[PDB]
What does this fold into?
Amino acid sequence: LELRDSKVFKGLLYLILYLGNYMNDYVRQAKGFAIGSLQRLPLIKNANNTKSLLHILDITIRKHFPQFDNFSPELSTVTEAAKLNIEAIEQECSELIRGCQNLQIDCDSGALSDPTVFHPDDKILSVILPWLMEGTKKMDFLKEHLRTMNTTLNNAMRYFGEQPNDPNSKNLFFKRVDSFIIDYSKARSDNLKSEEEEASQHRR
Amino acid sequence: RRPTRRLKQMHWEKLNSGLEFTFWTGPSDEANKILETLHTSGVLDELDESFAMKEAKTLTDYMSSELQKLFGIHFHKLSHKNPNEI
Amino acid sequence: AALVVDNGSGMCKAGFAGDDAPRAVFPSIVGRPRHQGVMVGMGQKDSYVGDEAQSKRGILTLKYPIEHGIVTNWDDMEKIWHHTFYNELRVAPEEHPVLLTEAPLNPKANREKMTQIMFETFNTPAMYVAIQAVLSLYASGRTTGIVMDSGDGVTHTVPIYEGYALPHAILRLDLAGRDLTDYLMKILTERGYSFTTTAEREIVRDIKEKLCYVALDFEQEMATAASSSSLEKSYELPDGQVITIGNERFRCPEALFQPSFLGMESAGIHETTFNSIMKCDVDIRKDLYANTVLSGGTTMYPGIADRMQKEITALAPSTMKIKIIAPPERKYSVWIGGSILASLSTFQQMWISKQEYDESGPSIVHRKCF
Amino acid sequence: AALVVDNGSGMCKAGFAGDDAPRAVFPSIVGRPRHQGVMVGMGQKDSYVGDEAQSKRGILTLKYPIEHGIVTNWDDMEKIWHHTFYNELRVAPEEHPVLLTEAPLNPKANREKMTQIMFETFNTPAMYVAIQAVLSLYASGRTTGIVMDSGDGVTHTVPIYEGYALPHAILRLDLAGRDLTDYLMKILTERGYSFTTTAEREIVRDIKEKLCYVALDFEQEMATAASSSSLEKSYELPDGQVITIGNERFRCPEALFQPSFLGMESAGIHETTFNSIMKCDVDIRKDLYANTVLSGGTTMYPGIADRMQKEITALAPSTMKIKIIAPPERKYSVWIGGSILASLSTFQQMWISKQEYDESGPSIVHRKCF
Amino acid sequence: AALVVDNGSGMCKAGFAGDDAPRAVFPSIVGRPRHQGVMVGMGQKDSYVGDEAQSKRGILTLKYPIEHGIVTNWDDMEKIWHHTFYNELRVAPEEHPVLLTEAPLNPKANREKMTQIMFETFNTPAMYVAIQAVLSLYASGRTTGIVMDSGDGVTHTVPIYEGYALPHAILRLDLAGRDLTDYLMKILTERGYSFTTTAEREIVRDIKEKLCYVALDFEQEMATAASSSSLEKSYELPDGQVITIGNERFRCPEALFQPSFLGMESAGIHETTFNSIMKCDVDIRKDLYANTVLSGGTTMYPGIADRMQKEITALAPSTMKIKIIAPPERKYSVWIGGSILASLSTFQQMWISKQEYDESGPSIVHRKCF
Amino acid sequence: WXAXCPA
Amino acid sequence: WXAXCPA
Ligand SMILES: Nc1ncnc2c1ncn2[C@@H]1O[C@H](COP(=O)(O)OP(=O)(O)O)[C@@H](O)[C@H]1O
Ligand SMILES: Nc1ncnc2c1ncn2[C@@H]1O[C@H](COP(=O)(O)OP(=O)(O)O)[C@@H](O)[C@H]1O
Ligand SMILES: Nc1ncnc2c1ncn2[C@@H]1O[C@H](COP(=O)(O)OP(=O)(O)O)[C@@H](O)[C@H]1O
Ligand SMILES: [Mg+2]
Ligand SMILES: [Mg+2]
Ligand SMILES: [Mg+2]
It folds into this structure.
């Protein structure tokens, strides 16, 4: 939701497209691109290979676009979400419902249903039943939360043009955005280190 | 506005299918002011000078293309010898 | 003259088309100083690449940019390629096309990244990328056979046919030179020698290349080594200390044929080669058996040709005939095969021209050179 | 009953099988008087072993017979064992079997001489050698997990899926409590305190045992200590002077997680645990993550369990759950586990009989024990 | 015109950058009279510092403001610098930067007060504090080698490889010429000469600087000295008395290699250097054995180079070639090395400017100097 | 040890 | 020094 409702990220994306379309040929003047195309920025170099397209984007942003000066603090949940595996979380969580659903048939009509075979000193029935009702109430909350995350993630995906049906895109969605963020920060750090030292040398 | 000289092409993947639901479709005024700012800022002029590509520097066979590769591989020891010698 | 640069996990070989030996062969490492510098005015660099890193490896943290055949650091890989052209070869790639070598079953991301990096940072006029295993048979002079590609990365068995790699029949194997190097220091601690740092890993690699060998019979050699001191050999460390290894000579290379020593469920290189052949068609099975070629530095152990032939003979049917081809130049088989392909007159057809790259984009590498 | 002797680099614990605590716990130091005896009234023994040397440590040169878990001086080790059986345990070894402990990945000559000494000097009826880390898991009532042992010489991570340890995934580092003591006295000179001699080394160990603690966030805690006060603690030396230590309280334990302070390229105690788990099977990784067990005196710092959990969580995938188990009596976990093993009825067939050693010599220790 | 002041425990050498020899060398002693003046005509002062104190050493109580490389009296230290700049160099420090030297492993408060005093009492434009052992390597012109800097209070070894120092292998010994002087006057009572007062210590120091030497074989020379009188030498006291010293000539310098005579547990200087090399990595040990550099006034004994070579050769492996460098001007190696540093063009970016000190304070020296 | 460390 | 030695 934060990425979808961030005007700074959209504005920065619009700026890159205009810069890219200026260099591109008239036959490939596209009006949009996928998020995965952001990796081509560091691999383009000038004549002396000193600076990249991302390197000069830092100076341009920090000279005529003060609004997009620093978006990393604005979008921090994206960086944290990049370390999570959505497919693994979905598989792990959905396993719990399968266990709970199977437990209900076992306690009510399965092997555990019959109390004759139970030992007299066997409090398994007297322990599972109080917890099962409480667990079911917590279980519906997890089911709602799973669908809520799936709906929001899918809605935020088609907004950026990513394919939701592709399993590859679901896993690597926030990581691709995170990969662009660290690249921008590294370029900004390199830009400050090179330029400030040059200015200090001239002053002294 | 187009540059006077060819520059480095920054290829992309384009958009999956079309602009049916993506935010690129929306013609918000925020996108418009970026175009006018870039057209006036001293950025497009700098791109032509620094990002000019280094030109290109380029450097009757009835025989099957596939079999050409095989013959050179087996007879690599006789590259310097004419076909009359082979 | 088209450059033939064969990047590798352990060593990268560079040269020119038509030559019979690589011009520059240096280790593929990028080391950085872990200690602060006190002497001013020396102009010490920030990162050392190649032979410079090895010479000063005592005060560096050597990191291999390529691990298990996948480039985990695309910033250090550009450093090595930059060092290969300007420093070791002293040739500008502006007027020389560059030939690169992939690995079997390579991810598509690496394929496009290699093309994008060199076509922009180095802007070479042309490029062609080929499989390392495919080039191994080209150097031997035969186009059909099965290659037991091994090295410092991951062992690959690629049964190529008519110069084309079979995609389904390729079997991977993580047993390589680095695993044996790590296993050698684990069993060398039984005699009281402790090599743990990355600087001392290079020392163990020197021991493996000079003293280690493959025994024809493991059980017979084990009893002989314990009974008599004939098998023991002495090695001298750079600091002057003399070490002695008694039975580790034939125990570290033996891990190739018995991976259970390292705890891997997968079978040895003797069974992987047999398994790969079975995946191919029945009619072409006869040709592959008699045209098996070893390649890479891992298969350079003395006696590995005889041990492989004997062990694969039992697994194979008695009707089949075994002929393990082990050329003496198998260390540079990948590079030599690349030079042969580059020098071909018909090789000009499948160049990836700079002009064609711009109009098509990085995706041209998948369909042009395959 | 069977004696359970757990010889350690810093301290050695001896007792009886079935007991819940070691009977005698004394430092494993042998000291000799450097000065010349002047009086004749008292005995003035040639050498002092154990707590006797600690009391008179001013006039002796304390020497540790064990370094990094390897017995460097076998003449002094015979003195300690002779002191354990005849002065502390006050029992005859000729009637009771003896159980010993050896660190993993040790020289074969270390445990070969242990068998020879036991069966020729003390004439013990039986003997056995067990891995120190394996016994640490038994004291916690578990048979599936990873044990993070850390003492004076060795800090080894031994993942134990079943009753037997996994040999291929054992990681051993030569960074332990003794290394931190040498680092503590190195950074203590920054405040003007100089401890050089071995007698002064025992003073530093007392400071480390009482004031040092592991900070949850090293970077944040360093800034807090920069504001002075609220963190300096006063310690009283045996002379009588009062010394104050500030940021040195958490800097010394921080060398565990950042070995770069000591100039060692090896990874920290948090990464070496994650690396050890990664060498196991995918199915077993789930159990090892949730059953991590700490042991040894080095892991007794206040807050090491909390800091270790945070570091592993960042490295490990977020799906897995991390649960670090820190038993209150983890200092004596190695001995307690040995007591359980010795008291078992099934273990009676694992003893090495005196006749068995005679027929095969000292070499039987490798084949039987593990 | 940077000032290079090398304050030492015994002597402080002050001069100018770019020269080859120190401009002024005087003892670093501040003495005050213990009597009361009787003549009013003479312009008696309160305290005498430098060569003036030595001339009147029979009356004053000489005190060393620097002890073991640590300034134990900051009131007296200011007097020496005030005497150095305005009387010996006769220059104003308000326009020239000052380079200072400090022993390694010194208290952090020592160099903090050095920065504060000059920046507030003399108002020097800049500063830099360098390690004494590092500067000694600059004088020799080398870049790799272990430097033994045995002075008057501190004996320290700092190994440097290709300009990158190793902070973990630095060993410091608190045994130097001043401790030998204290030991020399102790054994001089065995013949009938009693030197007790601080004024008479300078007489003993003159005896050591002319007659003492290092014997190649102490055990052999001890028997020879007790069987003849060829080793006896006669020295003339300032009062006219003639004293004769025999076996004490090679016994006082022998405490350097066998500190057990002084009652210290520290190893000899030959073992300290070897222990420092052993702490280094294996790959750099070969280059450190052949580039050992000696400096300081303590290492000026006749034959110390030959004795050190023999002692290290026994400990070092036989294959290695030990080459000890003993330049004839090793007494002023620290100052000469500092002259090259101050005159370097690259060094102008590492000066501690006044503005940088103003914003932070005395703590700036920690993060800007090694 | 023998080669490496001190032990 | 403070604690240890004399300096
Ligand atoms: N003579 C030899 N004997 C045994 N092993 C060797 C020998 N030469 C090289 N090796 C091993 O082979 C590895 C070199 O692998 P290499 O073939 O260069 O990899 P790649 O195929 O990627 O180029 C080294 O790490 C070394 O351990
Ligand atoms: N309370 C404590 N806090 C910090 N460190 C401790 C504590 N108790 C013991 N240690 C450290 O543990 C080491 C010994 O631990 P232990 O494993 O019991 O002996 P050993 O290492 O000889 O087997 C000592 O060197 C000491 O530095
Ligand atoms: N020619 C000499 N032979 C032996 N020892 C000497 C000689 N000259 C000076 N020394 C000793 O060296 C000590 C300090 O010398 P020096 O290195 O100049 O001091 P610093 O280390 O402060 O520069 C003096 O105490 C003196 O005893
Ligand atoms: Mg290869
Ligand atoms: Mg222990
Ligand atoms: Mg000096």
Q: What stands out?
A: The pocket of adenosine-5'-diphosphate (ligand 1) is lined by residues C 8-11, 151-153, 177, 181, 205, 208-209, 296-298, 300-301, 334 (CB under 6 Å).
